[PDB]
Amino acid sequence: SVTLWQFLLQLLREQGNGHIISWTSRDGGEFKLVDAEEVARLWGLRKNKTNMNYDKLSRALRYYYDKNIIRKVSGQKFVYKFVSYP
DNA sequence: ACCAGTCCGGAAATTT
DNA sequence: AAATTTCCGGACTGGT
Numbered sequence: 001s002v003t004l005w006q007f008l009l010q011l012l013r014e015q016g017n018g019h020i021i022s023w024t025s026r027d028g029g030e031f032k033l034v035d036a037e038e039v040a041r042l043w044g045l046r047k048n049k050t051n052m053n054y055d056k057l058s059r060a061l062r063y064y065y066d067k068n069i070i071r072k073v074s075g076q077k078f079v080y081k082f083v084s085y086p
Numbered sequence: 087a088c089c090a091g092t093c094c095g096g097a098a099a100t101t102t
Numbered sequence: 103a104a105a106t107t108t109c110c111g112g113a114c115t116g117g118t
């Protein structure tokens with residue numbers, strides 16, 4: 001029953017993932033998918049699937065925009081922002 | 087002009 | 103029902 005946003009948060013709150021995901025503003029809730037295809041693979045694997053990629057994961061993130069859960073940081077490649085404090 | 091990559095949302099299907 | 107997953111085609115951007 002895990003959601004994409006909780007999954008990204010766990011990846012960010014756990015040491016050792018800096019080569020694939022990283023804060024750019026911790027207080028701002030702003031993070032970068034440093035190795036986006038790797039993050040996507042890991043997200044698919046969370047559901048026992050081997051074929052999740054950045055296109056599909058990013059579509060799920062875009063569905064978060066209307067929900068005020070996550071927004072795009074405009075003009076920063078692979079950077080997104082949690083709206084509620086992470 | 088072409089190409090490759092990022093980002094967008096629409097629909098539809100599927101899964102929680 | 104809600105949260106995706108899947109698939110896709112366009113706009114925009116930078117380089118060649």
